[PDB]
Every structure is written in C-alpha cells, then in structure tokens.
Design a protein around this nucleic acid. Sequence first.
RNA 1: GCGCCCUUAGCUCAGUUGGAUAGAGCAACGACCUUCUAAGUCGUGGGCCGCAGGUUCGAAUCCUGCAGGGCGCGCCA
Length: 503
Amino acid sequence: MSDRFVIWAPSMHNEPAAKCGYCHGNKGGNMDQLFALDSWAHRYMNKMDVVKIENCTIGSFVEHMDVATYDRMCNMGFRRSGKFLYKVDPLRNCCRLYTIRTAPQELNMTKELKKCISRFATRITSEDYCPAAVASSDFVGKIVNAEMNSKTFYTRFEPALYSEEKYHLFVKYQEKVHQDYNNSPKSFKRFLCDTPFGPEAVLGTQESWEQLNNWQRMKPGEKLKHMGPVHECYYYEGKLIAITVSDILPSGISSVYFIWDPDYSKWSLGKLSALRDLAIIQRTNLQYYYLGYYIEDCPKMNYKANYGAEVLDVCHSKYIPLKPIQDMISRGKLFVIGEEETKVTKELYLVDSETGRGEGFPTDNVVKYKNIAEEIYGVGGCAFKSANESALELKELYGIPYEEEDLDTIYHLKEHNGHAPNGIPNVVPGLLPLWELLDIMQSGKITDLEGRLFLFEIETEGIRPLINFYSEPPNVKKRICDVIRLFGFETCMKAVILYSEQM
RNA sequence: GCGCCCUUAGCUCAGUUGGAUAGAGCAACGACCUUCUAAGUCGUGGGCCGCAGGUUCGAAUCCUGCAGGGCGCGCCA
Ligand SMILES: [Zn+2]
C-alpha cells in the first residue's frame, strides 16, 4: 500500500478555449502558434474557421507514486500539478508544457540580472560589520555565512501542510495582484496539501530536515534522505513575508509558485527564494534544480529563461539547454530531435531501458542542432501516409478496437459540440508511434508481461488471473495498451493500471 | 525587475563627499619612571587604496560595467 505506481487510463477531457488560463484561445493574428507549425498553418488557415481549437488535456487521475518511479515521470514530462498528473502533446494543443531543469554549477545568467544580486546583500548587512573585503568571484560565500550571524532575515524549513499564518497574505495578495476577490478556502487545501507523493515520503524523518536547515555548514558528501515537497518560510522579526513552495526529488528540486505579503514586501521577496535556493545544491550533494513547468505560448514566463532552464523532449527523452534553442522553441512550434539516421518516410524507433526512458541521455555542449520535427507530422512530412496505413494493420493483426480516421478528421469538428468526442488521437509525438508497437508484437516482448498483469476495473472490483489474452474484452484491452503508448514501456511492468470509462 | 546612494587604515570620521589619507580613541617605541615606559602626562611611529577600464597636467573622490557596500515596491502556475 502507498508504494506502487498508480496511474489511470488517460482520457482527453476537453473544454472550450475560454476556460484556458494562459492563452484564452485568442492570440491575435498569430494563428501559426495556435496549430503545430507553419506548414499546416498555410493550409489550415481557411479550415480553422470550420474546426474548433479547444484546450486538450492528456493526463490521468493518479492516487500515489513512489519517489523513485516518479523521478522518471517528472523527467518524462508528466509534471505534477494537483492530483491530475497530466501532460500536453507538442503537436495539437494550444498550451504546451514540458519539464525544465537548471544547473547551478555553470548557469549562464544574463548580465541584466547580475545587478539584482548586488542589491539584496548590501541592505541585509549590519552597516559597519563586514566579513572582510576579499574577492567574491563565487557568490556563495557572502550569503551562506551572513544569514546566521545576524537577525536581519532568517528562514526555516517546513513540510507541505496547513498553517493559519500564511492565510492572511494568501488571500490579500491574490486580491492585490491577482484580482481574485473570491477565494474559497479550498483553493489552499487542494493546491499545496494533497500531493501525489507518498505521505511517508513527505514526512520521512526530521533528521533529513535537521541537516537540511544545517545546509549552511554541513560538509559535502553527507548522505541526504529528503524526497518530496518542501516549504521554506521567510521570517522577518516575528512574522512572515514570503512562502517558498518547491519539491525536492531524490535527484533534484522542482519549484512551483511564490507568495508575498502585499504591503510587507519591503525586502524584494520575489527574487530572494530563487537566488537562495539554487545555492542549496552547492552546499548539499544534490544535482538538479527543476524550475517547474515551462510554457512558451505564455509570454510571461520569459523570466524563467534567465534561470538557465532546459526545454525537454518527450518523444525521445533527450534534454537540450534552453538558451541554445531559444529561437528554435519560439512561436510554439513542435520540437522533436532526430538522429543521424533521419528519414522522411519511416517512423521513429523507440528504446525502452532502465536508464533510457527519461533517465538522462548523453549530451554535448557545443553542437549545432537542427530541427527535424517539421518533416514528421506536418504537411511537408511524408510520415503521415505511413502512419495512415499503420492503423490498418493494427486492427487486422490481433483484434484491438483502433480504427483509423479520415484525412480531414485530425481535429474534432465544430459540429461535435453536441456529442463529446471521447478518444485518444493516434498522431501524437508524446504517445508512442505505431512503428515501435508493431515491432513489440513481432519480437514477442509483449508476451512476458502478458499473463502477469491483472484486470482491474473500478466499477467491477474483481480479481481474476489472465490466462488467454484474447478472452478479455477488446475495449478494455484498448485502454491497457494506451498507457503503454504514453507511460514508458518497461515502467508499466512495476505498476498497476486502472481505467476510466466516460468520466 | 527598474530608480537615485556611497566604494579611504583592524574602527568611527573628515578634503563644498575632486587637487597631499589627516587629527582622535587603539595597540608600538620613547627625554615621559616614587616598580603606574603591562590602568599619569607629553613627542607620535610601522597600521598607505578596493575589480576593470572611461574621457583630461589629475583618481581615497562625477562612475557606463562586475564582484562585494544603501533606499518605494514590481509583466512573480
Ligand atoms: Zn489553451
């Protein structure tokens, strides 16, 4: 209990584009960003008026997942945001997302923000007192040893729980900068108190917290044992003015949000948490700092570019630094990196390994990459014809209810408003392409997992062994292999999958 | 994220915060001692400068820049 990987069958629940929190479905005269790329933009310009563009969501209702398994998941792209563990395919949807990582050892921050760190260190010091005037090329030295020998601004680590003290600034700040004058209490309990991470992992032992607050003088090499969300309050005198919210994985730290007190924002609390929590890595033995979820379609997130982020890729699990591809990722275009064996007529082969399913790939710094995703799932790419016939063989090979769709049926018609078109699109770079699934059955690798997994329906509550693969209903079998196309091959081996019918 | 502030001894301070780093308390020596030159009072002597350049006989000193020293509060899923 509370230790196995739990993920339900994804169901693309869709809503009108007005409900979108970032894009609203309107981006002026920038219809190229709305669709995949320019190739279909030149052809769907007159067809977009007859086909509605909604806000597609790809995700599932998860219960709990162990920290070790989720580390791949947050590296894959399925970053936690509430209990709806979700992701957005890079092809169709109007608001794409994918995890990013930052490295504090060699971050290439811009010179514009270099003046910001010069401001917070002067005021905090107690005037005459100075820790000697020496060279400070590494900015760690003047912050770690200054927060403890004074009472200017001291912090304290806390778990992710409920605290009444934060409520005062949690409401007024939204009423002040977010214009959210109607804040029910459920907006705090749901967001930062019910996480998919294991409750024992969040609790752990206080010893991990004890050494965590001792990060200032702890010697590197000590074994860390912290895994889960983190809350680092920002005390001042005898109150709080900022609340840090982030999640520390067993391999890195992922940040989400920030909160200020409206009028008590004297000490420029916004940039303090960011600049004094990526320096945790140097003092500890951690390796990664995840900024969270990146959105190119939302211009507001451009400040995260200065954080040294890392635009991810979900089709091939190959990290690539944000700055070298700053222009390439612009305008909301697709981003799938090819290989030396690039082909414009055959689909991509996939790899299912313990370390080769989103557990880091070897990367070279000085490399002039090129974009090949445009020639795969677009007008100029011939891979669509091969994908069109790929679905035909799936139906006549084993008997799984996957039927192809016509040429002008890639997106739901505006006449489909009266009947919700529940289903999983086949042309999705995030989803496993049909090329690899075809080789799975031929190679016999599907057989090993066959006969070991149990059929588990939420509305049935029945346990029965699997002896004949074709005896189970095909519609249920359809949902089983859908997750195999989305959530790592092997993976599902150490996991149990549930299904949703028409939720 | 943008703003105006000051970048001189181990310290506080001068040179309208541009033309020698000087007094004073400290630690040093000493004609200064009833064994108060290791708790009097007087000569004072080592303690000399920050990272780069910038436009001028000139730079502790109009500072664009950087690391470190001052002040409203921000386009912060
Ligand atoms: Zn959207």
